[PDB]
Design a protein around this ligand. Structure first.
Ligand SMILES: [Cl-]
Ligand SMILES: [Cl-]
Ligand SMILES: [Cl-]
Ligand SMILES: [Cl-]
Lengths: 441, 444
């Protein structure tokens, strides 16, 4: 008992050496995430350029949309497979295992590989998110300054690695709260005690968010406007949407994990067949990035359109099915990019589809289709990655509609419930469990 | 250990169906309890102010009935605690925190009817207390109650239902579902070792309680401020300075509230009769102040939309601040059933606003609005005293609905916390538990 008394009067006393270093972590992470975010936008801008210069002859621009995206893809697939295998896919599970001290943090390799490799894939128009890169890069950035200044201890090592990935998430969504919550719900060891200073996480999370605020202010990622409020006699509709998401989540997990195996056979582990395969996929998303931009890309461009209900009931189903295919194909192929963002784009489409049904069935509720989208925006995350608390806050920090707080929680929970009862698994813990077992075998 | 991790990773987030349902009934109960308590308090504040009209002529008699009616209810609160549940004294949060560490007993058969009715008299009397203390501790005991009744077993089922009630309690006391959950995973849970708290189950009970609050309390938010202006980048450095001021006042406030507990303990010396009568004084003082200067009594929720707007004078804010400091300590450090959580939101909102007004005249080029600094300083005294910034920032984010000030709310809440450490300040809830848990050993 006396241990606790001694512990209580010493709580929240993180050494100054850690707190100051966390600041320079988030600083670098932000700048890197800023530079990364601009690079893709630049590489996307140039692919857009050659299309105008070759506006005539339909099969020409379709071809040059393929190649430029295919080449950039292969440029990324190779940068990974040669110098840093660990920087393939998201990187979140890699950082997760790194906090459990079950995986290494080779920053000298990860930092240049994940960055430029991300530039190639993301810039090609592939269906990936800035998360994966920024999350892993951030952790390595924080690990880098740990090695350089030669700090010592379990606390100093686990903290700077946490703040690094935290600042990476924030600078990828301008959502500071979403980053910090992600560490204490998904990233930190969910089974044993750790010496992670939440206070230090804040500092790093702030600086990167500040760094993002410096170069992108007054221009939000997603603007949806103020959506209608939600009555109490409507909440039961949001529970159903959760249940639907609750049984589709695990299925998506089977697909994202299964496709990683099926696509693996195509190359068998060979660097050349793999790269060539990525050129087909990378070239595909660039081709689709012309004939149907809704079926490719991060998916952030369709959310405000979908939530506004500007899409049709048929178009949504098309967009949904098509994106599901391209989402798997891109991420499951081991390409350096986040699955975090495209799952935000999926549910927004699925939720809107649910809304347009609820609108015509129950006209008495005076329903706006968009509310089911914002509720269903982070409804796949609460099913796949199994971190509902981080999902809601993140969505809240990008949609700015707190008036739908109870719908968002109900759906996200009715989802997370069924995603347990239907035998689902945390897609980030599952991937880590896959590698950690493939190592001792 | 790797092969042990892989085992756990594939078995992650598989909370038993039993707890998940029992968490639902906890929040359902904690909500219904929190609603009744809230409606009970308001009814008492409604009757006493209905007696100041029946005697609105004889000014001396008016100042007499505003004292006695609040003194009887105060004494009725102090007595119910000092006699049947001494643990129901103070806030109640440190008791639940100690319970999750398995160092304190959760006597729900005593606290539940004591904390509810005891705080009812004090809060309904107009003392500077909050609905937090009652609803949280009551909620925890409510969770503990259904734990003993249905004979649930395990370290997971025990710590969870106690946390769900604690979370469903805070949520129903602010209509802030996200706040109650974060409060459990940042301040309430054991901060030093692993704990089997089903966050998913916390999520369930919180909903049900918040839902129950929605059933009764609709169309009227606890705090309506309105859409404030934005916050430019060149404005951010100011909020940091605001944070530093909070970071050095909180620890001082902690020494006061803790010290005032020791000083007021010399008047009664533990004597039940003296202590109760000491409650009639402060309660009577509060009820009196509730009529001659309302901004010196009550919770303080009413003067938040006002101060944030700017309808108060700088001279008034200085008055309200000091007066509330004196009335809060006097009414909380006395051991009355009630929290210091809510009155520290008012203290911050005022101090925040007063910093805003100064900031405006000194920097008109920024085109400031003193309401920003008010909201940016609302959940700031919590940041310094309680050392639960992630809870405050979100809590304020829920009641004020101003996310465009998330950077200032955080930046202030950082310098607040950073300076709450660099001055030797301790978490107010932890320092209190560390007293009771040490006094429990000091007398053997
Ligand atoms: Cl991965
Ligand atoms: Cl990802
Ligand atoms: Cl207390
Ligand atoms: Cl309190």
């Amino acid at each position: 008992r006396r241990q606790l008394i001694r512990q209580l009067l010493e709580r929240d006393k993180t050494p100054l050496a850690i707190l100051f270093m966390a600041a320079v972590v988030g600083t670098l992470v932000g700048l890197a995430a800023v530079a990364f975010d601009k690079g893709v936008a630049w590489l996307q801008n140039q692919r857009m350029g050659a299309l105008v210069h070759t506006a005539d002859n339909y099969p020409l621009l379709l071809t040059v949309a393929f190649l430029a995206s295919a080449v950039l893809a292969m440029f990324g697939y190779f940068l990974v497979r040669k110098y840093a295998p660990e920087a393939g896919g998201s990187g979140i599970p890699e950082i997760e295992g790194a906090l459990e001290d079950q995986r290494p943090v080779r920053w000298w390799r990860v930092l240049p590989v994940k960055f430029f490799g991300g530039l190639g894939t993301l810039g090609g128009g592939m269906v990936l998110g800035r998360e994966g890169p920024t999350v892993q890069i951030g952790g390595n950035i924080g690990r880098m300054v740990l090695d350089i200044f030669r700090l010592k201890g379990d606390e100093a090592r686990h903290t700077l690695l946490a703040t690094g990935a935290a600042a990476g998430l924030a600078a990828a969504f301008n959502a500071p709260l979403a980053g910090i919550l992600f560490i204490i719900e998904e990233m930190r060891p969910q089974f044993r005690y750790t010496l992670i200073s939440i206070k230090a996480v804040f500092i790093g999370v702030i600086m990167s968010t500040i760094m993002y605020r410096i170069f992108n202010h007054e221009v939000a990622l997603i603007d949806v406007g103020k959506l209608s409020d939600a009555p109490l006699n409507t909440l039961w509709l949001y529970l159903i949407l959760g249940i639907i998401f609750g049984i589709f989540g695990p299925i998506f997990n089977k697909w994202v994990l299964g496709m990683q195996d099926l696509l693996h056979r195509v190359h068998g582990g060979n660097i050349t067949k793999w790269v060539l395969m990525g050129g087909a996929i990378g070239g595909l998303a660039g081709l689709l990035g012309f004939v149907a931009p809704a079926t490719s890309g991060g998916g952030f461009n369709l959310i405000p359109i979908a939530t506004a209900g500007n899409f049709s009931m048929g178009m949504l189903v098309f967009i949904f099915v098509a994106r599901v295919i391209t989402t798997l194909l891109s991420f499951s192929s081991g390409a350096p990019g986040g699955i975090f963002a495209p799952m935000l784009a999926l549910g927004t489409v699925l939720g809107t589809a649910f809304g347009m049904v609820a609108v015509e069935l129950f006209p008495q509720y005076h329903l706006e289709a968009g509310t089911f989208a914002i509720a269903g925006m982070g409804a796949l995350l609460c099913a796949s990655i199994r971190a509902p608390l981080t999902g809601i806050i993140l969505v809240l920090e990008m949609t700015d509609n707190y008036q739908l707080i109870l719908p968002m929680i109900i759906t996200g929970l009715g989802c997370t419930l069924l995603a347990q009862f239907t035998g689902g698994k945390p897609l980030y813990s599952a991937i880590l469990a896959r590698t950690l077992a493939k190592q001792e075998a």
